């Protein structure tokens, strides 16, 4: 229902598999036990066993490891009051703000390819807006637009 809300969820799900720190169906206990051995601020995205919850984000705070659910309402993503069109736009927002609730993502493969590390640097210095002002050919310009985030 709702119209273009279908086109958004189907697009993020592809990006959820593109990124490394999405663990799919994962138990809350193993998510907290995995992050308890990780440094402070390391977050993770996983599926939620609840019926009214699509995804959950588990982060290790200074006091304890918490798991926060992600609400999707009328094409906008929010954490359990700031709405976002993309799920990774929400992730990038809480990663850049001084609060530093999220710092690093615990990926299934901790060591990323050189292409991803370069892509993250290209977007950090130019931005997703200037992606078309870049002296790069289509094959590389499309790769930058495939996952345009500083994450």
């Amino acid at each position: 229902r709702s119209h273009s809300d279908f086109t958004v969820i189907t697009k993020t799900s592809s990006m959820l598999d593109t990124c490394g720190f999405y663990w799919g169906p994962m138990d809350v206990n193993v998510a907290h036990d995995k992050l308890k051995s990780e440094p402070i601020g390391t977050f993770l995205i996983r599926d939620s066993k609840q019926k009214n919850c699509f995804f959950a984000i588990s982060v290790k705070t200074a006091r304890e490891t918490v798991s926060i659910r992600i609400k999707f309402h009328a094409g906008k993503f929010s954490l359990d009051k700031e709405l976002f069109s993309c799920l990774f736009q929400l992730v990038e927002h809480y990663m850049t703000s001084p609060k530093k609730m999220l710092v690093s993502p615990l990926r299934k493969v901790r060591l990323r390819p050189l292409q991803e590390l370069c892509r993250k640097s290209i977007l950090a210095t130019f931005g997703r807006q200037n992606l078309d002002s870049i002296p790069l050919n289509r094959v590389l310009k499309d790769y930058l637009k495939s996952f345009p985030f500083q994450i």
Partner: peptide
């Protein structure tokens, strides 16, 4: 055990 903020 879930929370917010």
């Amino acid at each position: 055990e879930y929370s917010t903020v």
